[PDB]
Amino acid sequence: MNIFEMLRIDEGLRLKIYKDTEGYYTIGIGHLLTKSPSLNAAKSALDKAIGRNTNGVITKDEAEKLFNQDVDAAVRGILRNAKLKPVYDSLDAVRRAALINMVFQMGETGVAGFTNSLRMLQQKRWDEAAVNLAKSRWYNQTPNRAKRVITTFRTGTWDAYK
Fold it and tell me: Pick from 55, 57, 73: which is nearest to 7 by CA?
C-alpha cells in the first residue's frame, strides 16, 4: 500500500471529463480540470494538459501520466513550504502518506491553512488532531475521504484502506 494506491482508491479512474462531488470538472485519477462551470473550459484545460485535441477523452496512460505529476507536485508543494515540511519530516511513513493526500486533494495552500491540526500532528496528538480535523469545510464536503485519512492519521496504519 502506497500513496499512488491510496489516491487511486480515493479518486479512482475515469477517462472522460466528469464532475466531482463538489461539482468540478475532473478527469483521470482526481485531476481537477477547472472550477468553471464551463465544459468548454474543462475541454480547454484538458487538451492543453495533454498535448493534443481530446474532445474530453484520454488514455489510461495519459490519465496515469497526469497522476504521476499531480502526485509529484503535491509532494513538491509539501517540501517548498515552511509550514508543511517540519510536519512531514516529523511523520512516519504511513502518516507522511496521509499528509501527501491532503495536499493532493486541497493543495499546498489549503492545508498549510490547518494551522492547529498541523500542530497537533507534530506534537503527535493523534486523537486531538483527529477531531480538530473533523470540523472544516473538508470533512463535511468529502467525508468518506476525510474519514479515511483522519483514520490513517489516527492509527498510523492502513486499516481504513484495507
Answer: 73
2 is in an annotated binding site: no
- Is 159 considered catalytic here? no
Choose, from 5, 10, 11, 22, the residue flagged as catalytic.
Answer: 11
Rounded Cα gap, residues 162 and 156, in angstroms: 13
16 - beta bridge partners? 57
40 is in an annotated binding site: no
Contacts of 154 (CB under 8 A, 6+ apart): 126, 127, 130
Cell numbers 490519465 correspond to: 63
**Domain 1-162 top-level CATH class:** mainly alpha
Question: Quick check: is 11 catalytic?
Answer: yes
CA-to-CA distance for 116 and 69, rounded, in angstroms? 29
Catalytic residue chosen out of the listed positions 5, 10, 20, 92? 20
Q: Dig out the grid coordinates for 155 from the structure.
A: 492509527
Burial class (CB in 10 A: 0-12, 13-18, 19+), 131: exposed
Q: Where are the domains of the chain?
A: 1-162
Pairwise CA distance, residues 128 & 155, whole Å: 12
The Cα–Cα gap between 111 and 105 comes to 9
Answer yes or no: is 104 a known binding residue: yes
